[PDB]
Amino acid sequence: KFNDTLFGEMLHGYNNRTQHVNQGQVFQMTFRENNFIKDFPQLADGLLVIPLPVEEQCRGVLSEPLPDLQLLTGDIRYDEAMGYPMVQQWRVRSNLYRVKLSTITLAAGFTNVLKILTKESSREELLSFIQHYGSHYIAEALYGSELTCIIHFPSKKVQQQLWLQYQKETTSMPFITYLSGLLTAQMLSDDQLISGVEIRCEEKGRCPSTCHLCRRPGKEQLSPTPVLLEINRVVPLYTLIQDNGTKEAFKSALMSSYWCSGKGDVIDDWCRCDLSAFDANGLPNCSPLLQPVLRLSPTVEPSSTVVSLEWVDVQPAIGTKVSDYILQHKKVDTDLYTGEFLSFADDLLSGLGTSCVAAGRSHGEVPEVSIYSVIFKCLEPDGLYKFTLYAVDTRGRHSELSTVTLRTACPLVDDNKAEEIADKIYNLYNGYTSGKEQQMAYNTLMEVSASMLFRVQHHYNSHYEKFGDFVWRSEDELGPRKAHLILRRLERVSSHCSSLLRSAYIQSRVETVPYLFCRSEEVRPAGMVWYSILKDTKITCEEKMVSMARNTYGESKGR
Ligand SMILES: *[C@@H]1O[C@H](CO)[C@@H](O[C@@H]2O[C@H](CO)[C@@H](O[C@@H]3O[C@H](CO[C@H]4O[C@H](CO[C@H]5O[C@H](CO)[C@@H](O)[C@H](O)[C@@H]5O[C@@H]5O[C@H](CO)[C@@H](O)[C@H](O)[C@@H]5O)[C@@H](O)[C@H](O[C@H]5O[C@H](CO)[C@@H](O)[C@H](O)[C@@H]5O[C@H]5O[C@H](CO)[C@@H](O)[C@H](O)[C@@H]5O)[C@@H]4O)[C@@H](O)[C@H](O[C@H]4O[C@H](CO)[C@@H](O)[C@H](O)[C@@H]4O[C@H]4O[C@H](CO)[C@@H](O)[C@H](O)[C@@H]4O)[C@@H]3O)[C@H](O)[C@H]2NC(C)=O)[C@H](O)[C@H]1NC(C)=O
Ligand SMILES: O=P(O)(O)O[C@@H]1[C@H](O)[C@H](O)[C@@H](OP(=O)(O)O)[C@H](OP(=O)(O)O)[C@H]1O
Ligand SMILES: *[C@@H]1O[C@H](CO)[C@@H](O)[C@H](O)[C@H]1NC(C)=O
């Protein structure tokens, strides 16, 4: 049977790769020594439970708002006027205990199988051990009750307004409960600043009755049992062997299961894949080559004509080495057709290239994982684009492909000029007679972009619709064909843009933002069947600036 007790997972052993607790039973649980806490039963022997100080108990932290990274990876749809959807995390910890184990004798069943395997130096056998008993034991861990909530805002603007609205009306109440207050009360009203806000919570261990920051209507509880939150320290199970012969042989079998998919031995830095780990094309397949997830840049919203993309390097610390990232891109309108092919190594770092595409490599969250990025600066406005990415290892395997599809923004529209043209056109149509008027009316309407034409229509109909609609009146004064040529131009504007271009007012802000521009100093030595490691390529990185003109849409000019 399964011996379960509180604190709990400390005595059972932990796998690093699969991240699972309760893997076999490493240490024995006994009840000779008398360890109690509060309302909890008798603790197992040799584990030290220390409640965290009153400063840490029932404290909540609101994170800074950031774009929703989940919504920047696939088919990327978001309102251009809104911007990136934002998320903000709220987290409250309540029933906290720090749990260490010292000192405990080994389990009966653990030492039995440890006695028989010690002499029996076998690979398939040592892996079956790790499957059952895991790789480490947990040394230090944090238990308690945490409520983690995520507030999903539809835009960066909508938050800022709500945060400032909250900050005015509070100066008592947490930000999340103020929002939840207005969310639940909205059954009384309808559309407002809070329209698209959503809160999503996930609890690990139920909220105690005493703590008021994690209280949710039905779910309160008197003295809840603490749940594992963090694993602070792990120690490998080869510490427990007590002899130099087996604990070296076990260690190498552990490294095989972690780094080389259990189908190969690890030489310093790389996996020697035993045959036939090798794939369909006969290339070493024991170390996994992961899918690189192509993302939109969180800090740079794509404009019309300008898109910048990111991805985190898929290279493990040990095993596979990535030699290149292949990045294809096309404009759709097609399907299953190949876009312009770009080798990161060869086309983006080495061959210009510029000033339309630029690439960059940078140090990530915690080094050393690299953050590759590429920026497209000569794309076409109101266009749907598909970008795909895959990695290529040192021996020539491709990774699983990854995709991003997105629309570039609407083209810029001088809204003053549009309303001016509309009046010019109306006064010509009230002039009637002249063939110069007719020609010059037709010329000015055709000379300006389709979006501008759609906007002059919007204005023309706002004012002069009672005396004849824009198309109808264009047909009367310019004749059947010229009016149909005008009409057709308006068809070239998309559904998204035509919606946005019916706004009350359009204004133009100009953001100016930095991007990393890197070039290859050193052309690296490549073989026929093996290639050079991309990460080792010496590069010279310079910061540059893009100016990004955007339209700003609204029902009035006060934002
Ligand atoms: C869970 O589970 C598990 C448990 O355990 C875990 O696992 C782990 O992990 C970790 C992390 O990742 C790891 O660690 C790591 O490792 C790695 C690898 O290592 C190895 O190898 C290497 C290599 O080398 C090379 O080079 C050299 C020169 O010097 C030579 O010698 C050699 O040879 C090589 O080469 C190669 O080979 C050949 C030739 O012959 C050919 O093929 C070619 O050439 C190639 O290349 C090394 O280095 C090492 O070594 C070590 O050890 C030994 C014994 O064993 C000794 O003898 C030595 O001395 C050493 O030691 C020392 O040093 C080192 C360094 O410094 C250190 O570490 C130590 O401590 C001592 O001191 C081995 O063998 C590595 O690489 C890494 O490192 C890195 O990273 C870090 C962080 O982490 C840092 O700090 C450092 O610095 C580095 O960095 C660098 O690099 C990188 C890479 O790429 C980059 O990126 C950066 O930038 C820089 O530059 C580490 O260390 C481990 O191992 C593992 N373990 C096991 C058992 O498995 C996991 O993790 C977990 N998980 C979680 C927690 O999550
Ligand atoms: O020492 P160099 O000039 O870089 O070249 C090495 C050489 O081409 C080896 O044949 C190759 O192993 P395989 O061709 O057998 O894969 C090795 O890969 P490795 O160092 O990643 O094992 C290369 O690094
Ligand atoms: C349960 O604990 C006993 C010690 O009383 C131990 O002998 C037994 O093997 C444990 N069960 C498992 C599955 O480890």
SS (H, E, C) 13-51: CECCCCCCCCCCCCECCCCCCCECCCCCCCECCCEEEEE
Domain boundary among 461, 481, 500: 500
Ligand 3 in contact with 108 (CB < 6 A)?
yes
Same domain, 80 and 177: yes
Mutate to test the pocket of ligand 3, among 28, 30, 106 (most ligand atoms within 8 A of CB): 28
Atom of ligand 2 nearest to the CA of 267: 22
Cα 456 to Cα 450: distance, rounded to the nearest angstrom: 10
Q: Is residue 281 part of a domain?
A: no
CA-closest candidate to residue 507, choices 82, 81, 77: 81
Tokens of 236: 């490998």
On the question of a cis peptide bond just before residue 8, with omega within 30 degrees of 0, the verdict is yes
Residue 83: C-alpha distances to residues 157, 300, 552 (Å): 8, 10, 10
In a domain, 221, yes or no: no
| Helical spans, DSSP H, in 175-327 | 175-185, 244-259
Cα–Cα dist 419/461, whole Å: 11
Write down which residue in 158, 184, 214 finishes a domain.
214
255 found inside a domain: yes
Give the amino acid at 440.
M
What is the Cα 513 distance to its own chain's centre?
20
What domain range is 464 assigned to? Answer: 415-500
| Whether residues 441 and 478 fall in one domain | yes
Q: How far apart are CA 327 and CA 344, in angstroms?
A: 7
DSSP letter at 237 equals: G
For residue 24, give the ligand 3 atom closest to its CA. Answer: 14
Determine the number of helices (DSSP H) and then strands (DSSP E) in the chain: 11, 22
What 3-state DSSP class applies to 446? helix
* Phi/psi at 496 (5° precision): -70, -45
- Closest by CA to 31, choosing from 3, 2, 55, is 3
The number of beta carbons lying within 10 Å of the beta carbon of residue 512 is 8
Q: Give the residue carrying structure tokens 């993309």.
A: 309
413 closest CA partner among 491, 493, 333, 471: 493
Ligand 3 atom nearest to 28, measured from its CA: 4
Quick one: tokens of 381? 């406005």
Q: Length of the chain, please? A: 559
Closest CA to 147 of 78, 221, 36: 221
> Do both 430 and 309 map to the same domain?
no
Pocket of ligand 2 (CB under 6 A): 270, 394-395, 527, 529-530
Distance in angstroms (rounded) separating the CA atoms of residues 325 and 286: 20
How many Å apart are CA 360 and CA 543, to the nearest integer?
10
For residue 18, is it within any domain? Answer: yes
Question: Both 333 and 420 in a single domain?
Answer: no
98, 201: one domain: no
In this structure, are 244 and 352 located in the same domain?
no
Q: 451 is written with which tokens?
A: 């979006």
The two beta strands, 539-554 and 370-376, are: unpaired
Nearest to 422 by CA among 494, 474, 487, 466: 474
Count of CB atoms situated within 10 Å of the CB of 283: 17
Q: Tell me which residue has its CA closest to atom 57 in ligand 1.
A: 268
Q: 236 has which bridge partners? A: 136
515, 510, 545: which is closest to 297 by C-alpha? Answer: 515
Q: Which atom of ligand 3 is nearest to the CA of 3?
A: 1
Count the neighbouring beta carbons within 10 Å of the beta carbon of residue 173. 12
SS3 assignment, position 554: strand
Query: Which residue, among 395, 393, 404, has the nearest Cα to 314 in the 3D structure?
Result: 393
For residue 454, tell me if it sits in a domain: yes
Q: Please give the number of the atom of ligand 1 that sits closest to the Cα of 368.
A: 96
Residue 233 dihedral angles phi and psi, to the nearest 5°: -140, 135
Helix (H) or strand (E) holding 202: strand 198-204
368 within some domain = yes
Instruction: Note whether 137 and 27 are within 8 A (CB).
Output: yes
Residue 103 lies in a domain: yes
Closest protein CA for atom 107 of ligand 1: 255
Do 206 and 152 sit in the same domain of this protein? yes
Domain count, the chain: 4
- Contact 455/413 with Cβ under 8 angstroms? yes
Beta strands in 294-434 (DSSP E): 295-296, 307-312, 322-332, 340-343, 357-363, 370-376, 384-393, 402-407
Q: Measured in angstroms, how far is the CA atom of residue 254 from the centroid of ligand 3?
A: 25
Pairing of the two strands 198-204 and 270-273? unpaired
Round to whole Å and give the CA distance between 542 and 486: 47
Query: What is the end-to-end Cα distance of the chain in Å, rounded?
Result: 65
CA of 31 to the centre of ligand 2 (A): 57
Q: Is the CB of 268 under 6 A from ligand 1?
A: yes
* Strands (E) located in 63-154: 66-67, 75-76, 86-93, 97-101, 136-144, 146-153
Inter-residue contact 460 to 477 (CB < 8 Å): no
Please state, in angstroms and rounded to a whole number, the distance separating the CA atoms of residues 244 and 535.
36
Helices 156-170/175-185 angle, 10° precision:
100
CATH number at residue 407: 2.60.40.10
- In short, whether 239's Cβ falls inside 6 Å of ligand 3 is no
> Nearest-CA neighbor of 251 among 120, 106, 126?
126
Q: Are 534 and 345 in contact (CB under 8 A)?
A: yes
Residue with tokens 């840490």: 56
Q: Exposed, middle or buried: residue 65 (CB in 10 Å: 0-12, 13-18, 19+)?
A: middle
Residue nearest to atom 10 of ligand 3 (CA): 3
Of the candidates 95, 99, 93, the one whose C-alpha atom is nearest the C-alpha of residue 138 is: 99
Report whether 12 contacts 24 (CB < 8 A): yes
Give the distance (Å) from ligand 2 centre to CA of residue 530. Answer: 7
Domain annotation covers residue 288: no
In angstroms, what is the span from residue 526 Cα to ligand 2's centroid? Answer: 10
Choose among 397, 400, 401, 399: nearest CA to 281.
Answer: 397
Residues β-bridged to residue 509: 550
Atom 11 (ligand 3) nearest CA: 3
DSSP helix/strand/coil, 244: helix
User: What is the C-alpha to C-alpha distance for residues 462 and 489, in angstroms, rounded to an integer?
Assistant: 20
- Residues 20 and 52 grouped into a single domain: yes
Nearest ligand to the CA of 321 is 2
Q: How far apart are CA 441 and CA 479, in angstroms?
A: 12
Whose alpha carbon is nearest atom 17 of ligand 2? Answer: 530
Among 230, 239, 268, 395, residue to substitute to test ligand 1 (most atoms within 8 Å of Cβ): 268
Resolution in angstroms comes to 3.2
Residue 251 CB contacts under 8 Å (≥ 6 apart), including other chains: 236, 238
255 lines ligand 1 (CB under 6 A): yes
Judgement on whether residues 378 and 519 belong to the same structural domain of the protein: yes
What is the C-alpha to C-alpha distance for residues 220 and 113, in angstroms, rounded to an integer?
Answer: 45
Q: With breaks defined as C to next N over 2.5 Å, after which residues does the chain break?
A: 171, 333
Whole-angstrom distance, CA of residue 454 vs CA of residue 501: 7
Alpha carbon dihedral 475, 480, 485, 490, in 10-degree steps, equals 40
96-120 core/surface letters (b: 16 or more CB in 10 A; e: else): bbbbbbeebeebeebeeebeebbee
Q: Beta strands 402-407 and 75-76: pairing type?
A: parallel
* Ligand nearest to the Cα of 369, by number: 1
Query: Residues 31, 152: one domain?
Result: no
Same domain, residue pair 456 and 336: no
Asked if residue 287 lies in contact with residue 264, where contact means CB atoms within 8 angstroms, the answer is yes
The residue among 305, 547, 512 whose CA lies nearest residue 408 is 305
CA angle, 54 as apex, 49 and 55 as ends, to 5°? 120
277 sits in the region (left: phi over 0; alpha: psi -120 to 50; else beta) called alpha
Query: Residue of the nearest CA to atom 87 in ligand 1?
Result: 368
26-46 as b/e, with b when 16 or more CB fall inside 10 Å? bbbbeeeeeeeeeeeeebbbb
Four-point Cα dihedral 315, 320, 324, 328, nearest 10: -80
Are 426 and 485 in the same domain? yes
